UniProtKB/Swiss-Prot annotation, chain B:
N6-(pyridoxal phosphate)lysine, modified sites: K193
The protein's name: Branched-chain-amino-acid aminotransferase, cytosolic
Function: Catalyzes the first reaction in the catabolism of the essential branched chain amino acids leucine, isoleucine, and valine.
Tissue specificity: During embryogenesis, expressed in the brain and kidney. Overexpressed in MYC-induced tumors such as Burkitt's lymphoma.
Catalysed reactions, semicolon-separated: L-leucine + 2-oxoglutarate = 4-methyl-2-oxopentanoate + L-glutamate; L-isoleucine + 2-oxoglutarate = (S)-3-methyl-2-oxopentanoate + L-glutamate; L-valine + 2-oxoglutarate = 3-methyl-2-oxobutanoate + L-glutamate
Subcellular location: Cytoplasm
Pfam families assigned: Aminotran_4
Subunit structure: Homodimer.
Amino acid sequence: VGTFKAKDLIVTPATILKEKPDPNLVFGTVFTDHMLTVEWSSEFGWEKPHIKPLQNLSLHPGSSALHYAVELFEGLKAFRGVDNKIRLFQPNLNMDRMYRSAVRATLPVFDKEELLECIQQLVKLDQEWVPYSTSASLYIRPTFIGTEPSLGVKKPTKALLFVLLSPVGPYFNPVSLWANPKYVRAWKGGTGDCKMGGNYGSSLFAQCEAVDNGCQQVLWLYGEDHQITEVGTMNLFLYWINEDGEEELATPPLDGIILPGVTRRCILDLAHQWGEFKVSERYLTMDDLTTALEGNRVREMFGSGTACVVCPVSDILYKGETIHIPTMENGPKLASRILSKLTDIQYGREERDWTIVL
Amino acid sequence: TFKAKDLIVTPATILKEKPDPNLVFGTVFTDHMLTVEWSSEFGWEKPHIKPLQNLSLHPGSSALHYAVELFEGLKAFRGVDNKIRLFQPNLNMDRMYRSAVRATLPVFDKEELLECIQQLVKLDQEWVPYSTSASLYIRPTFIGTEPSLGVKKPTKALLFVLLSPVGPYFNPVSLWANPKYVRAWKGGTGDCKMGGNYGSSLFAQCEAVDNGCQQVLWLYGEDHQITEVGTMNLFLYWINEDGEEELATPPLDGIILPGVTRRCILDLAHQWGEFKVSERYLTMDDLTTALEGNRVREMFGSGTACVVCPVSDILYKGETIHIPTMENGPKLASRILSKLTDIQYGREERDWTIVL
Ligand SMILES: *Cc1c(COP(=O)(O)O)cnc(C)c1O
Ligand SMILES: *Cc1c(COP(=O)(O)O)cnc(C)c1O
Ligand SMILES: NCC1(CC(=O)O)CCCCC1
Ligand SMILES: NCC1(CC(=O)O)CCCCC1
Ligand SMILES: [Mg+2]
């Protein structure tokens, strides 16, 4: 029972550094010169955190992360603002979610402040990788895995916490969605509300089946009434005129099968803040969708996430039929506004608690 | 696909001493392992049988981030005639292959993989315990080693096999039944040995442990269907609602993993023909109602690690529900255990075993 502390950081600089890429960058493909690694054991607990040259992990073949998916991750960004100050966006929320995930995965808890500071140091050393752009950023990937060498399924007595850095650009460009009720992403009583690796491996089949039909992503449906939950691995937002005739920004509620995105939260806070229209966390089914469509009640639909921020949807292939979404034929005003707002806050073109400097 | 004919063998320079057959499941490993690299641009590399060593993986490998991984479990047994046998190995190759497809991992020639495994076990054959109550556990593992963080079909992967001598896993177990957690769901992948299905079980499993139990009784649906005993297929031996003696186990509707042991037990039950054999749904209420009527005789889980694992108690709604398995023999559990072990250790010759 304890934690590692940033003041104990053991930094080992890379002798040979790599050349930065061109800001104009396939997501998660390029990695910086250094990484963060912290060992753990139930015997001695957390060791001293290390910032060393990016290298391969040396894992026992029996590591529980390779057999029973004892792992979890996070994804946040650092932005080199217009005032050229490197900033983090709502990092503390990422530390809160990662912690909640480590517990749900039975992985060893840690001090969020210490980790966030270790991440600060790691990004500081490689601050030059933070894209000298305004449409690019630095992707931060915290990863927690069980390295228990035994094959028995149980709480790991060994784990490794690491952080990778990758400069990224994009990921508008409306997307087509593949809606097949035969596949379910999360279930009540499952781990769909956590960022645990196990919830992602089983979706590759659906994804491939998605591209096989010109769709860039999967629209995850759930239950008898086919509630629409998430766009691929992005939270789903629906801007429309509800059943009562009111202008509304809707999104599925956090009832266990939806991941509580940091971007989802921010979009909700902004929406409430403006008070220009009803904001509701409610259930949305395909029928609610189609009925609204054949009434011209829909305006926009988009997914939200750290990677895309705001990703417009234009089509849903459902029951062998392409259902068009007027998202683009309506601006998308709401979606563009939200992008500007967050972008302004991310790159320093506007002050707000949501960001941190260093 | 890789060919067993291209195996590159690098024997360990120093051999480890064999453990006492005592043995804690999957904690001791043999001298060698099988590794086969795959890439999207070149396909499979040649298979390597080399000394047990750590895996050097790029920190971005999808197996660490998105659970792009699956695994298998089977055993080698030293016969009473000293012949080492594999039990239904081709069924594991089949299941592993199906899982590979559902996981979007590269396909391989089932027969070639088996031959590579046979050769690995042959090299470390002295590890196959000289006991009729111990065996050599075989762990084929398939992981995606895609370097990029984008979520997609891997362009790089690794297939490896570890060997581990093991003893047990009748020590009746008590199960913890809490509907709040769900092992797998319709539309899911609970019918595959993909890593993802296990990581989410640890929280419930630990809750079962600090609550006086050793395994989780996985419940599903509004009517609380009893699906599996921990990660072992569930069997109920009783007199059903029609008053018929019956051996029942949940149907393969998608939330149940098709265990080889499960299929074998059903096979044996059907051929003995001494009672009704049913692949059907079983709910906590069917169970409790049956207990009150004294219709339950036995309950046990089945799996490679524990061929037959009897259940004695179930903590359900704030109460401990006793299952009379042990005071009923357990006649059928024993008979079944006896039969299967006799086949595995060669006391009986059957097509379910492959020698050397
Ligand atoms: C990571 C993730 C999101 C988005 O969360 P953000 O913190 O907003 O990046 C949404 N859905 C799923 C399933 C996710 O894994
Ligand atoms: C492996 C496994 C079983 C048992 O299958 P066998 O082929 O008999 O070893 C049962 N349930 C789950 C969830 C499993 O992973
Ligand atoms: N849809 C993508 C992410 C989330 C996001 O940033 O929207 C989750 C899977 C791993 C890559 C990131
Ligand atoms: N219940 C156990 C296993 C199966 C078995 O052999 O019963 C699956 C999880 C990994 C260890 C093996
Ligand atoms: Mg062939």
